[PDB]
RNA sequence: CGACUUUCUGGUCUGUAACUGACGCUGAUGUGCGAAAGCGUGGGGAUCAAACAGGAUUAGAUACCCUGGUAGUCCACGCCGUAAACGAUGAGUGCUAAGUGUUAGGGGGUUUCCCGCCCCUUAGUGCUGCAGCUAACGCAUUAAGCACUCCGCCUGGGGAGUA
RNA sequence: CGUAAAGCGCGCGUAGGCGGUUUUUUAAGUCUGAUGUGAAAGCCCACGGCUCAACCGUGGAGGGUCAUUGGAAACUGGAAAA
RNA sequence: UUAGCUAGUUGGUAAGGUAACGGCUUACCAAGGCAACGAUGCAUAGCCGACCUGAGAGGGUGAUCGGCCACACUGGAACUG
């Protein structure tokens, strides 16, 4: 979709070698539509423009669907990856999406209105936003199973 | 030692049906004879650890079989512990 | 694997033997130095290998076999 | 743990100990009864003053002093801050603070309100350093 | 005061080593605050058998009638299951 | 010891979920039979079957995977497990993933689904969560 | 070693009394896995101002800055102690007639021998302190022969 | 826990289903068993062996390089109960791609003993690896995957296993 | 607890922990209401006053793991039957 | 790093005694009676309603205010009503 970049930070990774100490400005960008699509990316560079270039290029490739109702997930689940797990839940309107900073940016690049959420386990942004993308890729909808199950909506339904 | 000779000898009697393999009455009789034999061995084998562990587990399992015979039955248990003279 | 040696030489023997009644089969069981051709290079199953080995080691203790053999 | 052993156990936390032994007056001046008073301040005197030296490169010479508060419990405490007019056996107020200067001590004096008078030449002591608004 | 059920307690007679007095152990179990699993716990009840007619293993109900001695509180109401080796 | 039937039932169901096959059978109980019928009602088990043999008859399940052998359901777990005899009254009925997620509950008459539970409003021992 | 630290005592006792004209009553060093802690009790006047500690510490540190026969660098603890002193000699008690002292005497009270009083006058072994214990006033003659431990105390 | 043997027993499993009818479960307390050293006693001492000393070395030399010898090691029981007893993988339960062995089993067909083959599991112990999961490492039917009753620990480092 | 902190050294086993398949009863639980009964206030909700707020007040809600009884027999626990 | 407590104690007998109750206390006879599911001992403590932080779970707290309990220099009493 319309690619909207979202980097988390720029770490310099000093790959010190024989002699010199080569530090690469490493930055991971997440590219999304904030309207039902998002995708993360990784890039190791020596500067902000090179890093954003490469990581946005990587991020716009892999995307997601972000199935929502009221612009919000029809269900509630939690995301987990490598002990960087995070928890998610919808929220009543006007309350706003609440989550830790970086994963909050992830979910606004999914474009949600009101969410119960909080980061857990690891505070490393990469790991926790990866648990986040796992969870978001593990969303479904009532119609999906109303098809999948022979039974339909309005009898076994959110 | 024992083998099935004295086993069957002492199961000839307490079998609710002579083809049974539960109803530990005959079976606990076998266990009684065998623990007696292994205790003779233990008096022969003054120091070890196999006789100790074996007697532990065997007598405990037979004890629990009795407890069952006291829960499953109420008279068979006593009549054994007076006839067999074990786990009274 | 595993790393045992040839079997089916029991085409006229088995499953349990001998222990001692043919010194010549024992000539082929293990080495002749007193050292033991391992189960790695003897072959029969650890049950039969172990029983044959204790047979030959008894023969050593039985003087039917030398414990160690010289040259 | 298993549910039963969980029941026959409290699952005790790892509750800490206050690294500031701030046992304020409590029952010190009657019955000499030990009492965990958490007062932010007790009045008391530094019977002796001193000065340990820091190592290189930052030879930021820090000065200490041993003090007794209302409970009169011995401790060697460093003085921070620039400027003073007190001496041996001067009454001093000590606040809880552990700094990078020297172990064996976890408290610190405060400037401005007692014998260790602060300096009103700076503007940071506008609400603190014991000194009034620099007017 | 029979309208008042007093304090009846079905339970087993555990001892009678008192003059005309027995002890009924009536079993209960209390909830856990954090958890919800428990085990059976009870309160022994020094109780007056009118002639120490009770026996060990006697499942029996009783009746709070009067403080009869030290912790001797509950009269027997009816011997339910006076038992011997079963 | 096979302490709980729910636990082994659900762990082997999740194992089949991983292995992506449908035809599997297992020693049942009357409750296992009834809940398997509830499963076929839910659908994600395309077919269930019960016979009798030692000791309880083998319940025979034949799953309804997705169009591409995907779990129509997402998650599955026991609730009433050894030691934890956990009950839910009329209002104590939970709603895993609301209607989409479901859970049978044993009640004073029998085992009923979450829809039945909040429908006839008889609580009971909540059994196992599936979503 | 102890001989070494004594040598530093003589070499650095020069500064102390050409700088702040103090005298070191001693220099002793304690160590806990790092540059040890040479506490030098600097004397001169009794009521040493903190500045009179800062400047003296400057002097002694500069003195040893170029002087350290001891191979490693170490913490200089520059101490300008107060009048508080262990009273072993009778003159130690005589000087302290102004200030309170606490003593541990062969005849204790309530198990332990240590008691603090504020001296009113000097009377050989006998004591006319305004000893204050449990908020109690009195002049109690503590026999020095009883005294197993005696130290001049803080004035508070 | 390996020289051989026996003692009089403890345990191992294939198949077995024999049938009372859950008799099962881990297991606080308790509690046995238990490297080595050490040691009490009573012997041995074959080594070995601290300490040791002769003695290099060097005022010093046991420091080590010597020479011998050395408590004890070794026999009787206790004390010893401790360790790297470590997989820092409690036990049992049963599920779950494979390839792919073992250690005993069994069966079927396969063929002269298929022993020869294959394959099915029995019950373990492999290596690679589905999935899964771990920071990583890797396990992965013998999970570190999935679950379940029951035990203990862990709470920064270390202070100090020490008081 | 595969390695950063954690599996005795390893046992036997008392209590106890949980409890196989099926058939009934029980209602103990369990669930499932009715009762009495949860000072008050605060407590949440609404609302009244105080300019308003603060605030009290008003009522409601909430508030037992309490006792009792209505069903119920899935389940665990019994009871019985294998 | 709190495991035995335990003798009017245990129970009854008779007396008394109190609103009652009973070792409640006397005399009797008898030996109990509790004890790891932690008695006992020690520290400590007013109690709760309530309150603070916590999404909550929870944790923590226990100012006035509601009540309940304990005390009134110290101990030993008792008159009164």
From Swiss-Prot, chain B:
KW rRNA-binding (keyword) present: yes
InterPro entries for this protein: Ribosomal_uS15, Ribosomal_uS15_bac-type, uS15_NS1_RNA-bd_sf
UniProt keyword Protein biosynthesis present: no
One Gene Ontology molecular-function label: structural constituent of ribosome
Domain of life: Bacteria
Alphabetical UniProt keywords: Ribonucleoprotein, Ribosomal protein, RNA-binding, rRNA-binding
Pfam family, one: Ribosomal_S15
SUPFAM superfamilies named among the record's database cross-references: S15/NS1 RNA-binding domain
Gene Ontology cellular component terms for the protein in this record: cytosolic small ribosomal subunit
One Gene Ontology term from the biological process aspect of the record: translation
NCBIfam families: S15_bact
Oligomeric and partner information: Part of the 30S ribosomal subunit. Forms a bridge to the 50S subunit in the 70S ribosome, contacting the 23S rRNA.
Family: Belongs to the universal ribosomal protein uS15 family.
Purpose: One of the primary rRNA binding proteins, it binds directly to 16S rRNA where it helps nucleate assembly of the platform of the 30S subunit by binding and bridging several RNA helices of the 16S rRNA. Forms an intersubunit bridge (bridge B4) with the 23S rRNA of the 50S subunit in the ribosome.
PANTHER family tied to this protein: RIBOSOMAL PROTEIN S15, BACTERIAL AND ORGANELLAR (PTHR23321), SMALL RIBOSOMAL SUBUNIT PROTEIN US15M (PTHR23321:SF26)
Protein name: Small ribosomal subunit protein uS15
From Swiss-Prot, chain C:
Keywords: Ribonucleoprotein, Ribosomal protein, RNA-binding, rRNA-binding
Residue stretches spanning the membrane: none
InterPro entries found in the cross-reference section: Ribosomal_bS18, Ribosomal_bS18_CS, Ribosomal_bS18_sf
Entry superkingdom: Bacteria
Biological process per Gene Ontology, one example term: translation
Molecular function as annotated in GO: small ribosomal subunit rRNA binding; structural constituent of ribosome
Gene Ontology CC annotations of this record: cytosolic small ribosomal subunit
NCBIfam families: S18
Family that this chain belongs to: Belongs to the bacterial ribosomal protein bS18 family.
HAMAP family: Ribosomal_bS18
Quaternary structure, from the entry: Part of the 30S ribosomal subunit. Forms a tight heterodimer with protein bS6.
Role this protein plays: Binds as a heterodimer with protein bS6 to the central domain of the 16S rRNA, where it helps stabilize the platform of the 30S subunit.
PANTHER family tied to this protein: 30S RIBOSOMAL PROTEIN S18, SMALL RIBOSOMAL SUBUNIT PROTEIN BS18M
Annotated protein name in UniProt: Small ribosomal subunit protein bS18
Curated annotation (Swiss-Prot), chain D:
Cellular component GO terms, alphabetical: small ribosomal subunit
Keyword terms: Methylation, Ribonucleoprotein, Ribosomal protein, RNA-binding, rRNA-binding, tRNA-binding
Protein name: Small ribosomal subunit protein uS12
Transmembrane segments: none
One Pfam entry name: Ribosom_S12_S23
GO molecular function, one term: tRNA binding
Residue numbers of 3-methylthioaspartic acid PTMs: 101
Species assigned in the record: Staphylococcus aureus (strain COL)
UniProt xrefs under SUPFAM superfamilies: Nucleic acid-binding proteins (SSF50249)
Curated annotation (Swiss-Prot), chain G:
PANTHER family listed in its UniProt record: RIBOSOME MATURATION FACTOR RIMP (PTHR33867:SF1)
Protein name: Ribosome maturation factor RimP
Localization in the cell: Cytoplasm
Role this protein plays: Required for maturation of 30S ribosomal subunits.
Keywords noted in UniProt: Cytoplasm, Ribosome biogenesis
Record-level GO cellular component terms: cytosol
Entry's family note: Belongs to the RimP family.
Source organism of this protein record: Staphylococcus aureus (strain NCTC 8325 / PS 47)
GO BP of this protein: ribosomal small subunit assembly; translation
InterPro entries: Ribosome_maturation_RimP (IPR003728), RimP_C (IPR028998), RimP_C_sf (IPR036847), RimP_N (IPR028989), RimP_N_sf (IPR035956)
Gene: rimP
Cited Gene3D superfamilies: Ribosome maturation factor RimP, C-terminal domain, RimP-like superfamily, N-terminal
């Amino acid at each position: 979709k319309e690619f909207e970049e979202r980097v988390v930070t720029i770490n310099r990774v000093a790959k010190v070698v024989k002699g010199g100490r080569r530090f690469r400005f490493t930055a991971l960008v997440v590219v999304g539509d904030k309207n039902g699509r998002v995708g993360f990316g990784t890039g190791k560079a020596q500067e902000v423009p090179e890093a954003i270039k490469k990581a946005v290029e990587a991020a716009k490739k892999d995307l997601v669907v972000v199935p929502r109702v009221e612009g919000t997930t029809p269900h509630t689940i939690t995301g987990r990856y490598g002990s960087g797990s995070v928890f998610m839940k919808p929220a009543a309107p006007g309350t706003g999406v609440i989550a830790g900073g970086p994963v909050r940016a992830v979910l606004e690049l999914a474009g949600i209105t009101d969410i119960l959420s909080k980061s857990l386990g690891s505070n490393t942004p990469i790991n926790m936003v990866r648990a986040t993308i796992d969870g978001l890729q593990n969303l479904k909808n009532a119609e999906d199973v109303a098809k999948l199950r022979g039974k339909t909506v309005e009898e076994l339904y959110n | 030692a024992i083998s099935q000779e004295r086993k069957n000898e002492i199961i000839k009697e307490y079998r609710v049906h002579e083809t049974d393999t539960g109803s530990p009455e005959v079976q606990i009789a076998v266990l009684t004879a065998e623990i007696n034999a292994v205790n003779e061995h233990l008096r022969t084998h003054k120091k070890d650890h196999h006789s100790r562990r074996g007697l532990l587990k065997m007598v405990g399992r037979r004890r629990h079989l009795l407890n069952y015979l006291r829960s499953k039955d109420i008279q068979r248990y006593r009549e054994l512990i007076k006839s067999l003279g074990i786990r009274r | 694997g595993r790393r045992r040696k040839k079997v089916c030489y029991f085409t006229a023997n088995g499953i349990t033997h001998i222990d001692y009644k043919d010194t010549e089969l024992l000539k082929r069981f293990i080495s002749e130095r007193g050292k033991i051709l391992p189960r790695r290079v003897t072959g029969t199953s650890a049950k039969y290998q172990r029983m044959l080995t204790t047979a030959i080691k008894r023969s050593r203790h039985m003087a039917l076999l030398p414990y160690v053999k010289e040259e | 743990p298993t549910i039963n052993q969980l029941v026959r156990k409290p699952r005790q936390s790892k509750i800490k100990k206050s690294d500031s032994p701030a046992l304020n007056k409590g029952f010190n001046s009657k019955k000499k009864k030990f009492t965990d008073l958490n007062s932010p301040q007790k009045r008391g005197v530094c019977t002796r003053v001193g000065t340990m030296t820091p190592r290189k490169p930052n030879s930021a010479l820090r000065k200490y002093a041993r003090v007794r508060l209302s409970n009169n419990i011995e401790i060697n405490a460093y003085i921070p801050g620039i400027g003073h007019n007190l001496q041996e056996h001067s009454v001093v107020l000590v606040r809880g603070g552990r700094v990078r200067d020297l172990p064996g001590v976890r408290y610190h004096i405060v400037r401005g309100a007692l014998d260790t008078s602060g300096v009103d030449g700076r503007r940071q002591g506008r609400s603190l350093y014991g000194t009034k608004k620099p007017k | 005061s029979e309208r008042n059920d007093r304090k009846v307690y079905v339970g087993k007679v555990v001892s009678d080593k008192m003059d005309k007095t027995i002890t009924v152990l009536v079993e209960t179990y209390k909830t856990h605050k954090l958890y919800g699993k428990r085990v059976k716990y009870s309160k022994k009840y020094k109780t007056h058998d009118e002639n120490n007619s009770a026996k060990l293993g006697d499942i029996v109900k009783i009746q709070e009638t009067r403080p009869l001695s030290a912790t001797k509180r509950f009269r027997l109401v009816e011997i339910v299951e006076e038992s011997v080796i079963i | 010891t096979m302490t709980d039937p729910i636990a082994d039932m659900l762990t082997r169901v999740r194992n089949a979920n991983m292995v992506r096959h449908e035809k599997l059978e297992l020693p049942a109980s009357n409750i296992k039979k009834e809940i398997a019928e509830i499963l076929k009602s839910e659908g994600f088990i395309k077919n269930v079957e019960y016979v009798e043999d030692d000791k309880q008859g083998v319940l025979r399940l034949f799953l309804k995977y997705g169009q591409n052998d995907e779990r129509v359901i997402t998650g599955l777990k026991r609730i009433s497990k050894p030691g934890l005899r956990v009950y839910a009254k009329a209002s104590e009925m939970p709603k895993v993933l609301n209607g989409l997620g479901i859970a049978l509950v044993s009640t004073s008459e029998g085992v009923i689904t979450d829809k039945e539970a909040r429908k006839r409003n008889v609580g009971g021992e909540i059994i196992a969560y599936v979503w | 070693m102890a001989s070494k630290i004594t040598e530093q005592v003589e070499v650095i006792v020069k500064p102390i009394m050409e700088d702040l004209n103090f005298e070191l009553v001693d220099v002793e060093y304690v160590k806990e896995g790092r540059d040890h802690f040479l506490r030098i009790s600097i004397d001169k006047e009794g009521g040493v101002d903190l500045n009179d500690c800062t400047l003296a510490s400057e002097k002694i540190s500069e003195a040893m800055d170029a002087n350290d026969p001891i191979p490693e660098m170490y913490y200089l603890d520059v101490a300008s102690p107060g009048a508080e002193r262990p009273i072993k000699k009778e003159q130690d008690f005589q000087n302290a007639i102004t200030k309170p002292v606490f003593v541990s005497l062969y005849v204790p009270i309530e198990g332990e021998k240590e008691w603090l009083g504020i001296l009113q006058e000097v009377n050989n072994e006998t004591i006319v302190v305004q000893v204050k214990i449990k908020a109690r006033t009195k002049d109690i003659e503590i026999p020095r022969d009883k005294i197993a431990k005696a130290r001049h105390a803080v004035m508070i």
